[PDB]
Scaffold this active site. Structure first.
Site, short mmCIF file in Angstrom:
data_model
loop_
_atom_site.label_atom_id
_atom_site.label_comp_id
_atom_site.label_asym_id
_atom_site.label_seq_id
_atom_site.Cartn_x
_atom_site.Cartn_y
_atom_site.Cartn_z
N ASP A 9 0.94 -1.45 0.05
CA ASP A 9 0.13 -0.13 0.21
C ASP A 9 0.96 1.32 0.03
O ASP A 9 1.27 1.65 1.06
CB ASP A 9 -0.95 0.03 1.06
CG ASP A 9 -1.70 1.24 1.31
OD1 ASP A 9 -3.03 1.47 0.64
OD2 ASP A 9 -1.39 2.17 2.21
N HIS A 816 -31.35 4.48 -5.20
CA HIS A 816 -30.71 4.93 -6.41
C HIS A 816 -31.49 4.17 -7.67
O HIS A 816 -32.31 3.64 -7.49
CB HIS A 816 -29.42 3.97 -6.26
CG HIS A 816 -28.47 4.11 -5.15
ND1 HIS A 816 -28.77 3.07 -4.29
CD2 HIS A 816 -27.52 4.92 -4.80
CE1 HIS A 816 -27.97 3.39 -3.21
NE2 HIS A 816 -27.39 4.83 -3.38
#
Length: 1339
Positions: A9, A816
């Site tokens: 990361d 949505h």
RNA sequence: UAAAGAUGAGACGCGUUUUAGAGCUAGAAAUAGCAAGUUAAAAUAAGGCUAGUCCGUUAUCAACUUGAAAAAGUGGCACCGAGUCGGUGCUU
DNA sequence: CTAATCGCCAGCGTCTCATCTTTATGCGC
DNA sequence: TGAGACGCTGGCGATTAG
């Protein structure tokens, strides 16, 4: 042996890493400890993070490098003036230069006389009384014709040489034309003569010559055009006024007979453009431009010269003297008026330097703005100060001569004053008559920007070329340096090379050979649509030669598309046609032996932009063209650089001969590039010839990105190398790479969050809605999603004809509009506001056919009124198109999977090149390691869905946790779907039809490769159950296996418990990277003199006790010193010593002599330990400290708070911010309200950790009292403050924080005595290898 | 087409430090009451040799063992567990 | 008589010119 | 043809504490 994977990361200030096995477990291992600590073995885990400081750009160093060059050049100018004046100065006063140089010294250290100028007190005070300022002397020397002594002339000329103003104006200025009204009347009379109509304009004459208003740069050319109705601004007079006002005019269209006359008086292209302009117009317009230039000059110099022009030839002097006199008059008036009216404030106003009165304005550090702000209420309450307040509003109240706004003065005024001095003083002094040109050139000389530093090869910034070997001097600059070669190298050293042959320079973009390549290797044979025949692809050698010579040559325009039918859409061929338009001869370009001449011509026109350089370059090429041709040519410039070299096409044999069906009619450029028989072998040899032994650092340096991330990439590479070395020297199976999101975007979005209110107001205005009066436009409602949706919907339901408004939030829904393929979109583009009614009847689309047919008109009106975005409107209207087709689902898969950032693939390619280094028999790469790139959205959605919440303010473990989650998600995704490797895995893979091989008609039923996706969500196989748009729930199998194999990729039962056990794991290797501090020597401020010993001398012999200086030096690193020091008696001592940045080289020259000079005696050479910043110590009970300085310490421990408490804090802080189903919100609210007693346990944990490692008893007691007194307040704000409370136990430097109203200051550890008897820890980049040294055994 | 970022070059105006720009009167003084403020010189990272009208705040850097440096090399595995890692077994 | 703690402090504005990338995106269609 | 100012963390003088 075993197989494993590595998850990374990459961040700006952190790099996380983790090592997992095939069943998502983190291995542990026993590690050997070196040193002498009597602890031979330690056990550690293979998860952790690395922390470091951000990188810095070179801008701050460049801005000081330029300043150093500027200072030494100014000193060289002053030295030149001393050198010329010294011969006549020797007879007048032999020590005048020495008195000038030594003027900084104090009296007891000065030689000669204290007084610099004359050497005696009465003459010095007489000169000060006669001339209060230098401008008195300068104006006296300008005006008076009497002979003066050389000293005063020298000081005046030195002042002009040292301060000379800006160089932003080209040409010459005559200050005698300062009358704005006379210039306006002259321009009016000029247009009265020139124009056919008798009036100048429809406004007539009104003598409105006051055009010196504040700002209003183009507002003269607009507003005075509004006070001159007539031709306005698009007319001939408006363009002339804009030319005098500085704006770019349009004589090509507004004026007649001018082809192009874009001109600017400040620009050096003026009068060079105007000669060609006046060639095409008669003499009637010629007289107008002189008046326009006079008016432009009159407007320009009127900012500075606020004096009558008919006084003298030093108007700057006149303005400064009148400012000084006004200052004196108002000072006397202020003193008298204050003494008569307010006697008690006189001492404060005129004596106390620490206030913003006159004493603080002059002797103190107050500015004129501070003085005006302080004195304004006094003058408001004070009588008889009306004119003083008026002049305060005009800020001409006690202005000094050396003011900040003096930068607007051009150098022509100073040149005029110096020329007046020279012209009026030649007759007395013959050497002053003899070097007038030299003095003027010393003032006016300036190094061109394309020449650069005048080094002799020892500088890494210079590129200037010498035509001779002698000292560069401002009076022989034109005959020493090669201006054309230097200006060429200025461009060439910063343009990139060719990719195919990285040793040859690129070609100009508008080059004729490049144009012939573009029309030849392309747009021919198969590349042509029809190839001028029935067959779209044919050889047709002579036919295409004639087509190029007739259809394209002498006919290249938009018409080529129609003309190509009988004998590509992007071929232009414009440079040759512009050459025909200029030359009007068709032999040089038709002849192929002159091609080098045309290439050289376009090369010069692209290389040089200055008008003088092009003529000098083309002076040697003047044997075949005339003056009109040169005048037309020198006004034409190109720009841009291509991508292909020259010997790539002409040197390699040629490719220009073999292209366009001569060798093969199969796009011969790419085929010849890939043909290894005669061309690609040389390219491969050239590419392999690069000396890329240090290819890691070179490839990092050539990346396009910030140094803050170019540091993290290198640290990531080193971390991966160390991990591979640790894990038995076995390569991993998969590597997952994730790039962290930017942190600056949060503050920028918070600043720009008010734009939603502006957009809502603009939409309401465009729609003409009267509902805007019932609501405010404050940013508080903008942060609310429901309020923003209600504002954007204009009080109407987005999927119904009913009215919603702001009556009740519980009667609304936030469902949505595209959940059919589960794109996982939470933005307002996919959101909609409507009542509790579903208004839906299917799962394949949230809106139905009846709903679309009902609301189509309202949707069209909202789209026209810019209330609904195009994508949202298209998604709302997609129901009539037949729902989400296979193309839409494939686009959803691509958008969820494929990343688009360009730096991630570079990092992936770097790691792949470092990992895979094996070739097969057919020279094929052996890709045994798969490098995988993922988006942050997948991991963030995983954390939100499976309640692996994070809080960044608790500890630093979240970097390692992010790395581990990256690893598990990437490995699961690559195990389950091996057919999508071409999208999210770096390498060479065959692409697949996502619309066909990754899609299904219904329920994902059938054979293999059809059960991949029916719902386009990628992370759907993790969930134990999924729900559709309606109230239907479809279950999933507990064990998820591959479709084409029996491999198990995910268990719902056991694998979640393993990830929970990993995320509650206490021991995580956190390592702070030690760095030797570099930068500035100290703080830049120069402090007044005092007797303290902490001051640093500014020079070799400037004693800080007598001259002040700098303090606060920066320590590079500390060294542990054991020795014996006198106390008349020698006593053994062990102590630290701070080696600052300034003395680091002297310390490293000979440390024995360094410690002998610092007073230490009998030091041991081998016991000196280098201790850089952030070095770690052990002490007692695990209390770790990081060495911040030679006399400071930092906290170095981490709090391992349990995941239950972390989850409780995250749930409590977002009590009213969580997004989800209303049924899920009530469960979380009940979960928070059922565990209120966790807060006391958290406070007990903080106290127990603080009493052992922190040792901050006063702050701890204040914290406990503050927590006790605020218990009645609700859990939301209480937990929000408890999150703030963790700054006490954070790792790093101590910092202050707030808990409700009380502010807790920082507790600082200002003693390094306790670390002398601790155990120092030297740890590697992963922290797995350590070397512990017990410092108590030293001595 | 616009915006942003990263590089490099040439210039401007300030600021900050010492010094020059004679302060006056009353007491034995401590101190009090008046007058004057606008400017100039030098330095602007200490300094360095390659001696240039150059260079000096970016990048890179745990320990130990070789090597002038570049650079190379140095650390057993499995299993039960967990308060910053512990224990057991095998082996070297 | 030395050591620990509290409060303060940090050089700054402008202009001209050149090269390269990366991310939205408009016009035409 | 424009957003608005903080924020950071080690050094230093003056004061208090043992």
């Amino acid at each position: 042996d075993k197989k494993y994977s590595i998850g990374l990361d990459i961040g700006t200030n952190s790099v996380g890493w983790a090592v997992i096995t095939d069943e998502y477990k983190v291995p542990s291992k026993k590690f050997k400890v070196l040193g002498n600590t009597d602890r031979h073995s330690i056990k550690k885990n293979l998860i952790g993070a690395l922390l470091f400081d951000s990188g810095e750009t070179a801008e701050a160093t460049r801005l000081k490098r330029t300043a150093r060059r500027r200072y030494t050049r100014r000193k060289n100018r002053i030295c030149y003036l001393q050198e010329i004046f010294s011969n006549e100065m020797a007879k007048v006063d032999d020590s005048f230069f020495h008195r000038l140089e030594e003027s900084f010294l104090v009296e007891e250290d000065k030689k000669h006389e204290r007084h610099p100028i004359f050497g005696n007190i009465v003459d010095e005070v007489a000169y000060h009384e006669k001339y209060p300022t230098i401008y008195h002397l300068r104006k006296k020397l300008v005006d008076s014709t009497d002979k003066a002594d050389l000293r005063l002339i020298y000081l005046a000329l030195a002042h002009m040489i040292k301060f000379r103003g800006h160089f932003l104006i080209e040409g010459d200025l005559n200050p005698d034309n300062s009358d704005v009204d006379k210039l306006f009347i002259q321009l009016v009379q000029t247009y009265n003569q020139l124009f056919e109509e008798n009036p100048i304009n429809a406004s007539g004459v009104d003598a409105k010559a006051i055009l010196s208003a504040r700002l209003s740069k183009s507002r003269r050319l607009e507003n005075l055009i509004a006070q001159l109705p007539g031709e306005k601004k698009n007319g001939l007079f408006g363009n002339l006024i804009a030319l005098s006002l500085g704006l770019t005019p349009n004589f090509k269209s507004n004026f007649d007979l001018a082809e192009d006359a874009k001109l600017q008086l400040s620009k050096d292209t003026y009068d060079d453009d105007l000669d060609n302009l006046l060639a095409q117009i008669g003499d009637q317009y010629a007289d107008l431009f002189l008046a326009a230039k006079n008016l432009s000059d009159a407007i320009l110099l009127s900012d500075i010269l606020r004096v009558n022009t008919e006084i003298t030839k030093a108007p700057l002097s006149a303005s400064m003297i009148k400012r000084y006199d006004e200052h004196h008059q108002d000072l006397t008036l202020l003193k008298a008026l204050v003494r008569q009216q307010l006697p008690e404030k006189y001492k404060e106003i005129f004596f106390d330097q620490s206030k913003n009165g006159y004493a603080g304005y002059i002797d103190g550090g107050a500015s004129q703005e501070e003085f005006y702000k302080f004195i304004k209420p006094i003058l408001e309450k004070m009588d008889g100060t009306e004119e003083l307040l008026v002049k305060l509003n005009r800020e001409d109240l006690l202005r000094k001569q050396r003011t900040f706004d003096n930068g607007s003065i051009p150098h022509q005024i100073h040149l005029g004053e110096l020329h007046a001095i020279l012209r009026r003083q030649e007759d007395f002094y013959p050497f002053l008559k003899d070097n007038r040109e030299k003095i003027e050139k010393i003032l006016t000389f300036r190094i061109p920007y394309y020449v650069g530093p005048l080094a002799r090869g020892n500088s890494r910034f210079a590129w200037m070329t010498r035509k001779s070997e002698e000292t560069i001097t401002p009076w022989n600059f034109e005959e020493v340096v090669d201006k054309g070669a230097s200006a060429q190298s200025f461009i060439e050293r910063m343009t990139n090379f060719d990719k195919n042959l990285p040793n040859e320079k690129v070609l100009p973009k508008h080059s004729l050979l490049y144009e012939y390549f573009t029309v030849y290797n392309e747009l021919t044979k198969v590349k042509y649509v029809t190839e001028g025949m029935r067959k779209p692809a044919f050889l047709s050698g002579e036919q295409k030669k004639a087509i190029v010579d007739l259809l394209f040559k002498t006919n290249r325009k938009v018409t080529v598309k129609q003309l190509k039918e009988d004998y590509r859409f992007n071929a232009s061929l414009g440079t040759y046609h512009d050459l025909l338009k200029i030359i009007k001869d068709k032999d040089f370009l038709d002849n192929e032996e002159n091609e080098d001449i045309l290439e050289d011509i376009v090369l010069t026109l692209t290389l040089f932009e200055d008008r003088e350089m092009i003529e000098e370059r083309l002076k040697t090429y003047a044997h075949l063209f005339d003056d009109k041709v040169m005048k037309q040519l020198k006004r034409r410039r190109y720009t841009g650089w291509g991508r292909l070299s020259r010997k790539l096409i002409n040197g390699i044999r040629t490719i220009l001969d073999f292209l366009k069906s001569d060798g093969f009619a199969n796009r011969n450029f790419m085929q010849l590039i890939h043909d290894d028989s005669l061309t690609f072998k040389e390219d491969i040899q050239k590419a392999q010839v690069s000396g890329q032994g240090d290819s890691l650092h070179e490839h990092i340096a050539n990346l396009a990105g910030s140094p803050a991330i170019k540091k993290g990439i290198l640290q990531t590479v080193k971390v991966v190398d160390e991990l591979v070395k640790v894990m038995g020297r076995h390569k991993p199976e998969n590597i997952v790479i994730e790039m962290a999101r930017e942190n600056q975007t949060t503050q920028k979005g918070q600043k720009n969050s008010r734009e939603r209110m502006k957009r809502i107001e603009e939409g309401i205005k465009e729609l003409g809605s009267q509902i805007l009066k019932e609501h405010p436009v404050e940013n508080t409602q903008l942060q609310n999603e429901k309020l923003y949706l209600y504002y954007l919907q204009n009080g109407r339901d987005m999927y119904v004809d009913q009215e919603l408004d702001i009556n009740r939030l519980s009667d609304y829904d936030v469902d949505h509009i595209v959940p059919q393929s589960f794109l996982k979109d939470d933005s307002i583009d996919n959101k909609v506001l409507t009542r509790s009614d579903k208004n839906r009847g299917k799962s394949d689309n949230v809106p139905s056919e009846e709903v679309v047919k009902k609301m189509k008109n309202y949707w069209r009106q909202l789209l026209n009124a810019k209330l609904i975005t195009q994508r949202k409107f298209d998604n709302l209207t997609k129901a009539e198109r037949g729902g989400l087709s296979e193309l839409d689902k494939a686009g959803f898969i691509k958008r969820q999977l494929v990343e688009t950032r360009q730096i991630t693939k570079h990092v992936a390619q770097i790691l792949d090149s470092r990992m895979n280094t094996k070739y097969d028999e057919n020279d094929k790469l052996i890709r045994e390691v798969k490098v995988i790139t993922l988006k942050s959205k997948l991991v963030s959605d995983f954390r939100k869905d499976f309640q692996f919440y994070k809080v960044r303010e608790i500890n630093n473990y979240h970097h390692a946790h992010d790395a581990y989650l990256n690893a598990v998600v990437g490995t699961a995704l690559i195990k389950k779907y091996p057919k999508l490797e071409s999208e999210f895995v770096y390498g060479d893979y065959k692409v697949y039809d996502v619309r066909k091989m990754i899609a299904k008609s219904e329920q994902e039923i059938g054979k293999a490769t059809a059960k991949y996706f029916f719902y386009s969500n990628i992370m759907n196989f993790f969930k134990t159950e999924i729900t559709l748009a309606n109230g239907e729930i479809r279950k999933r199998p507990l064990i998820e296996t591959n479709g084409e194999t029996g491999e198990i990729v995910w268990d719902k039962g056991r694998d979640f418990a393993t990830v929970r056990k990993v995320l509650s794991m206490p021991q995580v290797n956190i390592v702070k990277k030690t760095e030797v501090q570099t930068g500035g020597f100290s703080k830049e401020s120069i402090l007044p003199k005092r007797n303290s010993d902490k001051l640093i001398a500014r020079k070799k012999d400037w004693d800080p006790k007598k001259y002040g200086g700098f303090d606060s030096p920066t320590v590079a690193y500390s060294v542990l010193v054991v020795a014996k020091v006198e106390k008349k008696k020698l006593k053994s001592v062990k102590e630290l010593l701070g080696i600052t940045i300034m003395e680091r080289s002297s310390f490293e020259k000979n440390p024995i002599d360094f410690l002998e000079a610092k007073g230490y005696k009998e030091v041991k050479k081998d016991l000196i330990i280098k201790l850089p910043k952030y070095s770690l110590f052990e002490l007692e009970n695990g209390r770790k400290r990081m060495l911040a300085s030679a006399g400071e310490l930092q906290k170095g421990n981490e709090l391992a708070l349990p995941s239950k408490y972390v989850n409780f804090l995250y749930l409590a802080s977002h009590y009213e911010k969580l997004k989800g189903s209303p049924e899920d919100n009530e469960q979380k609210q009940l979960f928070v309200e059922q565990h209120k007693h966790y807060l006391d346990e958290i406070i007990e944990q903080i106290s127990e950790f603080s009493k052992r490692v922190i040792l901050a008893d006063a702050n701890l007691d204040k914290v406990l009292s503050a927590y006790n007194k605020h218990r009645d307040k609700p859990i939301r704000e209480q937990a929000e403050n408890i999150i703030h409370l963790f700054t006490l136990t954070n790792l790093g430097a101590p910092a202050a924080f707030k808990y409700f109203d009380t502010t807790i200051d920082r507790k600082r550890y200002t003693s390094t005595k306790e670390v002398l008897d601790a155990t120092l820890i030297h740890q590697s980049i992963t922290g797995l290898y350590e070397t512990r040294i017990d410092l108590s055994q030293l001595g």
